[PDB]
Amino acid sequence: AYTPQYYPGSSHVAVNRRKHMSGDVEKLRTVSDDDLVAALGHRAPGADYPSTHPPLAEMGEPDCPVRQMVEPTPGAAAGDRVRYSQFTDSMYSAPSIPYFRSYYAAINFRGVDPGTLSGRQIVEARERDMEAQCKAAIESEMTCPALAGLRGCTVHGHSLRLAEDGMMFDMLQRTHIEGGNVIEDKDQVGVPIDRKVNLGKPMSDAEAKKRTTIYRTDGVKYRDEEEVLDHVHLVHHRRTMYGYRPETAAETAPGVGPVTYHTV
Amino acid sequence: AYKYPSEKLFVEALKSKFAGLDLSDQKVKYVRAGYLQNARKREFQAAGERVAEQRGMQQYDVNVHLGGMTLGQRQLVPYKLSTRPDIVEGDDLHYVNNPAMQQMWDDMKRTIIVGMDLAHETLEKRLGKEVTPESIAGYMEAVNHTMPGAAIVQEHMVETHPGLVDDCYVKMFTGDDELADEIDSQYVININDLFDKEGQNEKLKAAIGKTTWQAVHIPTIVVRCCDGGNTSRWSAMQIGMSFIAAYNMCAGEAAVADLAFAAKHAAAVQMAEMLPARRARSPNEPGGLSFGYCADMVQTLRVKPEDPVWYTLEVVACGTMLYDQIWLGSYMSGGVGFTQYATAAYTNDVLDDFTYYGYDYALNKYGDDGTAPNDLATATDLATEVTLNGMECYEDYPTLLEDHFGGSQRAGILAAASACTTGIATGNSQVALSAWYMSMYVHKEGWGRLGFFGYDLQDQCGATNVCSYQGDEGCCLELRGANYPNYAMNVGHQGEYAGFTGSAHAGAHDAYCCNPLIKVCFADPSLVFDFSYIRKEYAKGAMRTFRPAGERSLVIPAGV
Amino acid sequence: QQMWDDMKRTIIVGMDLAHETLEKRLGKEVTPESIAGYMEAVNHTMPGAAIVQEHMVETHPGLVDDCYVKMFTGDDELADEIDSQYVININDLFDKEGQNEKLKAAIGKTTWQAVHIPTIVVRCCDGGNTSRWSAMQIGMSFIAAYNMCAGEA
Amino acid sequence: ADTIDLYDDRGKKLKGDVDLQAVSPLKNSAILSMVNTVKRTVAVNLAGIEKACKNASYGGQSRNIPGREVDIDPTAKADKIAARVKELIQVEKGDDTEVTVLGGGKFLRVAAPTRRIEAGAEYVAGMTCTAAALTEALREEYNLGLYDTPYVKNAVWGTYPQTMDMKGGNVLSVLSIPQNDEGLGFALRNIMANHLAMLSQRNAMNCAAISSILEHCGVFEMGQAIGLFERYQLLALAYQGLNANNMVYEMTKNNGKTGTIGTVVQETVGRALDDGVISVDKTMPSGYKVYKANDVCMWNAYCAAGTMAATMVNCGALRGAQAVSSTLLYFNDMIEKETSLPGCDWGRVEGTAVGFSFFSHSIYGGGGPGVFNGNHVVTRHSTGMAIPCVAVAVALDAGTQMFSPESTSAIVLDTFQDVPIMMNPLKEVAAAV
Amino acid sequence: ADTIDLYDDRGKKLKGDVDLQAVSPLKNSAILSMVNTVKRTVAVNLAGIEKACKNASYGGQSRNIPGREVDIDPTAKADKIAARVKELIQVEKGDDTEVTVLGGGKFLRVAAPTRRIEAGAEYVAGMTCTAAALTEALREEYNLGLYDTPYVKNAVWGTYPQTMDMKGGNVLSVLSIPQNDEGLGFALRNIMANHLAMLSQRNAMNCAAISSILEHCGVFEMGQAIGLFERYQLLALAYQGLNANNMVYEMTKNNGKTGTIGTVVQETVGRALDDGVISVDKTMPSGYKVYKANDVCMWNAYCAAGTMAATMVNCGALRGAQAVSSTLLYFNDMIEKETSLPGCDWGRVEGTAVGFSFFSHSIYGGGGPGVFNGNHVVTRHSTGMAIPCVAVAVALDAGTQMFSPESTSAIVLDTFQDVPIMMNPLKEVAAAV
Ligand code: F43
Ligand code: F43
Ligand SMILES: C[C@@H](OP(=O)(O)O)[C@H](NC(=O)CCCCCCS)C(=O)O
Ligand SMILES: C[C@@H](OP(=O)(O)O)[C@H](NC(=O)CCCCCCS)C(=O)O
Ligand SMILES: O=S(=O)(O)CCS
Ligand SMILES: [Cl-]
Ligand SMILES: [Cl-]
Ligand SMILES: [Cl-]
Ligand SMILES: [Cl-]
Ligand SMILES: [Cl-]
Ligand SMILES: [K+]
Ligand code: NA
């Protein structure tokens, strides 16, 4: 079968990007089921999953050939509500960047609705499926609990100076450091919870730069990653050419000029 | 030629916001002061207390913000108007709070340009009247009495209060210097005096020819009570009354209807046409405003064409405010709206730094204004260099990144600097448009983010639709506008497109971009807003020093 | 001028469908207490003030003092449970010839918001602004009042 | 059932005892062909494209985009471009696509294939496919590239898609865009009276026919010719537009030397009485006779024919279009005073004429008669019994208008001058029976 | 020339080596019939008319006009009313007029005669003639008079003509009014995704076909399938909407148990490479391979099929419509990253999806997927390669939506569930070749 290559580039940042896309992300910490459910804020830990419609087996389905060959996720079969996890990630070398969180979701999980924005990245899915996807992300090297956190609202912070203790600014201060560990004591929409969810130690600055997918001047400078720039240019050029005419001849139409690439 | 200096242009504003700050520091102490840190928020809270007490119903209250926190858990930072000394609180740039911004749009909306040649031909053909400088002069006196809402034919007419309509007037303009010199100068836009640099006056007169036009500006209060669709109709009614009186016509004969059709339709040049049903709007509203017309309304180009960047960035300031803050942020949505989506393009000298850097790069690599190759390779080079340099600025100066805290702001500013550099360098708006989309693609891969959820709808459609020639895709940038299908929804683009449309013609050393009638009309100093220096006007509005038209103080009570 | 501006700046918006959305999609319970919190939120946000994000700029409350939202309903038990400052009292206003009963029978046990956006907004813009402005701040207020994701399906 | 005799534009009998249903828009093959022709035919202004490109005047209204001139000469390559357009738009060789060079190369007439209309929902495929074919033909012939082709596209399509229409463009239809319809079924009502005069080549009898046919096709599409209203509308079409029983032509001839609006009123009443359409009902004490209609729909049809003949007599004497508005008003006002029966369209011709008079003699809008049409807010109110008279008056004008057929619709004349349905509509309608 | 194998909704081969042109909107008789059916067919809500009259709720939106109730019961007389409507609208005995009582009398399906469409310029003659025939039938049946018939007329026509549409009325089309077109040629693009899901009876393969066919018919009417662009559009129609070569069906089957958006990306690239559509162009120092398209329009068609299969796999797994917006975005973003070739519609599917995601997850407009259509400002931007995926996602949803097919489009299901072109579109398209 076809072997994916995912993304160009040769720096360790490009290597990290391919790790996130391929799902080959190291597990770094453990978050209990009850702690994660409390943080997400959609139901009480241990409570039954609420439903938005009856289980498929109980209500039946239309005679659709696609339904009959596409297996529903566990949460879809059960009729769970569609709920969400949402993360914000610092531009000061957080492990994750928004688009690559969405690629991780889209490549590696079934029945997911990821969304990418500058200051927030969301995964919507049937509740129990969403929980499993969030657990994978939050336990992995995609997360530093100082540089990233669950924020379902009031997300400001990705682009701000870090606090003196290295925590990304949160207007609602849903997390804080206690004894070297990041503690979350509000749910993702700012409601106090009756527990202290221990997300463990923040990454060192050096570890963050080894694990990050972002290019910036204090790490891997974007200007030096000529393979990614070539890729961007190739895609823009071919889009421009084929919007004019969808044929090979458009690639040398008048107006293209002496286009040139670094590595190809 | 221009030489980019050793200190970034945005450093002054950073130092003025953060006295004593080490601009390399990536960390800061958060004090979580809340709203009490800020004089404007405190003034708003007190205003909300009075509102609630006077009407018996809760209104503004900072404590209603969710999460038990008020605005200002971080520092609330003010904004320097770019190229100005004025630093203002952010709320002072909200369109609702800023009369300069309101009056800029009202001045556009209340304007219509109406040809006189067809009307004169009608008088000659149907009535056998001779049109002379003397008859035109009598007409210009008549139309400046009637246009604000006063009577010239009937008995027992009631009229508008002249003080409520003091901003309404009509001037004529023409490429015929002999006619222009015969009419009293109070009634004429003097093309030669206003367009005295780089032979711009001769370019405009050659383009307009020996044709005669009226620049009509109906009262601000009228468009405020009503809409932009009032403008061409109001204009035509009083043009018609004035022709009736000035040419001794029957006050309502068949020939009058030819004058009406001419003034309403055949010789009328709207600022904007109507919009489709989902966003139904009358003519002369922002969604119908083309980028070429927007660029031509701004007048910095007649003051200092030797600095193409300045005019370019005044167009950006004009367009980003109008299109993002008033049009998208109000007409098409509302609420708190979209102030900072637009301020990023006209404050803190940020876009200026990134654009002058690019201008210097292009001058050194490709040569003089407007001489760079008009091709995709050149757009690629300029966009990539300008975008990489800007991203490096945001990375090296933490408080710069914190200013443009939303990715959408960063995307529009990096892409505007890229496309304005390309426009000035190549003199070609369409090539600049390729550079705009290239900036976005470069940006996305560097940081793994771009703008808001729906920022790059036009972005991802963008490269392939620059050079399409299909019916609803192909269009030169000058004729695109806020109703071009891909552009019809989203912040952070429309005013920047007007800006680099201006940049291409500034780089070519043209006198205008799209319509010489628009260019002359908006050069007139008798307008309320000063179209020659947009950001200076915005500062006045933010400082409560801009006097708008349309207020009703003459006809309302006051008292304790 | 103000008569016309009062008409142009008004939109009536049902609440039942919104409440059904919260129940069906999020499993939220809608109660007089949650509605009261929503009414406070919408009267702060409607004139042009912020409830979710940080570093928002806002309209001057004095320039938008005419903007507000009240609810009305043919359900007298719900109307009685909400602070009177937020409610159009059909029984007090329509006290002649049984008009109140005719209105309540026609409306039924459905709930509505009477939204009046700022006069200054329709003066700078047009009547098309009204339903859109209303909806933006209704949306922000539901997000806050029901602890939604601030931007979910 | 009703029968009519069909007479031509010169008062000659063509066919006797024709079933009224045989001239219906739903049945008569000539009418159906007229509708298909107006839907699928477009005019191309090659000279306008050439000027726009050479002068960078894309979009019109004094627009000029400095530096963006494209130096191409399509009027000199009109035959080559026409052949490429035909190849690009034709669905099958031998289909009904036509592309013809007119004006020595200044214009094209493009009859787009009917199948492209059939495959769509509206009538615009002729406009869109012609504009697209022209843009491609110009790109190929002039070796245009990535960054200049967009400007040439605007020379063809105008400011579309920033505007809903091809404003300032160089592709023209006698129809407008669908979004300009005032209501449901109005597209065939939106035909400028100046265009109708040119379709007819200023033959006023043929004008009445072309305009009446298209107006009633619109009324049928509006759903306003169902049941009893079908006979009502068809009789109006036949007697006002199709010179049924030679009434329009003969009444005009009888009144053409010394007649007036009032003498045409008198002849119409006399004909209705002699033909049994109306009778004396009661007599008042003064001697004034109240009439009754024995056939209500036929009385309307007689009033419709009288309204047309009165237009021909009064505007023909003036050799001026403007008198049509007062003619429609006073013919109907006075015939009601003469009979105590309601006039044409039960007051709606008179009402249309009241507002049309106002809006063709005041400051507020409208213009001269040539700017009106069945979709115009002023002149829409009668179901087809006013606009044909307007078009006729425009055709009879000898040169009193500023917005004249020659000044607004010149390309329409060249495009339809050799199109048989427009050259002899009454003969073609009769031959289709 | 290009050929395709046609396969049905269950993955079975129908016809081999079919010329691509034989599935063109301009040529395939089944497609042409589908367009004719959607233009001329209307649903009548007799129960809604009855309720409006009995409750004086003319115009909807909580309107009540006290005292103006008209007590009529058309649902109880539906067969008589249906027969009268048929007699009033049929042009000739034995023509293609159909009037059928549905729901025990609650509804009628009215297929107006094609000749009424042919005689007009647009598609509205079905809506207008049906509304008129119904109004007359009710007036006759219930002995209505001068002052109450106007109210019953508003029960049928809604607030027309104060509004341009029949707002609050009881005559329904799957199309909208022409004045709602965003631009030229958009009428067949203005079909709500919830309606498309009901036309298909929630058969997602048939939904893809119906929606893709109608979208590309619109693109043809827009003039955007001329010359080389005809092959570009036809290949997308065939591969994305007509299950050409069984690719959509097989990719969905192959990824249906455990697959994701990303695995569908991988299979699409592998198929393009194995089939010779793309080849390795150059290799970067890291070993990343840049590909080249050997057949540009074919590469697009493969990306369109992959976008569809990815929707079926991801929304099918969720049994929820909302994931269609992210599926279209991330399938195309990641296939570009995987290949350095441009994605479906050269970024316009991705771009549509960016704004569609935003406007289906924000305060500012839009809604759930079911409210979108090819004429919606958010979702118009691709030439037919996005909306069919939206409609499929709507069909696959198991009950997560507030504005669902059953809540907005129930009458469409009843009107079209027995209509052969909507029951088996892939079989009817193949049989027409
Ligand atoms: C509720 C939404 C979803 C939606 O449809 N609109 C919202 C909210 C809306 C509200 C917020 C007002 C308030 O706080 O009560 C207003 C002002 C529009 C209005 N209704 O008046 C707005 N956004 Ni938003 N919105 C903005 C932005 C943004 C940035 C902010 C990211 C950050 O790091 O702070 C992100 C998108 C992104 O990540 O790219 C964003 C999201 C969001 N935006 C999320 C809420 C995010 C949160 O929970 O904190 N906006 C910006 O990026 C800058 C401009 C800013 C707008 C106000 C202005 O222009 O002054 C405001 C524009
Ligand atoms: C020039 C027209 C043709 C036209 O299109 N509109 C006019 C004029 C227009 C102007 C007159 C302004 C001025 O005096 O400079 C305005 C005010 C509209 C405007 N442009 O603002 C107007 N008429 Ni007029 N017009 C009026 C009227 C009228 C009455 C006046 C008859 C009389 O005996 O005085 C007649 C029509 C008639 O005979 O029925 C009339 C005609 C006319 N009306 C004749 C000019 C009559 C004249 O030569 O004196 N108006 C009225 O009948 C009452 C309302 C009055 C309107 C102003 C108001 O409502 O306060 C004004 C409405
Ligand atoms: C007729 C039409 O004008 P046009 O013929 O399109 O110029 C229309 N005016 C009006 O209806 C003017 C009504 C107000 C003035 C007369 C009041 S009696 C309008 O501007 O849209
Ligand atoms: C999409 C459409 O909304 P609807 O889907 O029709 O409700 C459209 N709104 C917009 O485009 C909102 C634009 C401004 C707010 C978002 C700026 S990014 C409008 O109201 O006509
Ligand atoms: O969060 S969203 O991108 O939907 C809106 C930003 S204002
Ligand atoms: Cl190819
Ligand atoms: Cl701190
Ligand atoms: Cl009948
Ligand atoms: Cl009778
Ligand atoms: Cl081609
Ligand atoms: K206004
Ligand atoms: Na005063």
Author numbering:
A (entry chain C): 2 to 265
B (entry chain A): 2 to 561
C (entry chain D): 103 to 255
D (entry chain E), E (entry chain B): 2 to 434
Quote the original article.
Here, we obtained the true atomic resolution structure of their methane-capturing system (Methyl-Coenzyme M Reductase, MCR), circumventing the isolation barrier by exploiting microbial enrichments of freshwater nitrate-reducing ANME-2d grown in bioreactors, and marine ANME-2c in syntrophy with bacterial partners. Methane capture, the first reaction in AOM, has been proposed to be carried out by the Methyl-Coenzyme M Reductase (MCR). In the proposed mechanism, the heterodisulfide, made of Coenzyme M (HS-CoM) and Coenzyme B (CoB-SH), would react with methane to generate methyl-S-CoM and free CoB-SH through a radical mechanism catalysed by the Ni-containing tetrapyrrole cofactor F43019,20. Despite their physiological differences, these ANMEs have extremely conserved MCR structures, similar to homologs from methanogenic Methanosarcinales, rather than the phylogenetically distant MCR of ANME-1 isolated from Black Sea mats.
Here, the original sample used to initiate the enrichment was collected from the Amon Mud Volcano in the Mediterranean Sea at a depth of 1120 m and a temperature of 14 °C. The microbial enrichment, grown at 20 °C in batch serum bottles since 2003, mainly gathered ANME-2c (with a relative abundance of 32%) along with microbial partners based on 16S rRNA gene sequencing. The derived sequence perfectly matched the one of ANME-2c MCR from the metagenomic data. MCRs from ANME-2c and ANME-2dO contain reduced coenzymes trapped in the active site (i.e. CoM-SH and CoB-SH). ANME-2c MCR includes the conserved N1-methylhistidine and thioglycine, the common 5(S)-methylarginine, 2(S)-methylglutamine, and the rarer S-methylcysteine, didehydroaspartate, and 6-hydroxytryptophan. The dimeric interface is exclusively formed by the interaction of the α-subunits, mainly via the C-terminal extension. The dimeric state does not disturb the access to the active site. Due to the low quantities of MCR obtained at the end of the purification and the slow growth of the consortium, we were unable to test whether this dimeric arrangement reflects a crystallisation artefact or a stable entity in solution.
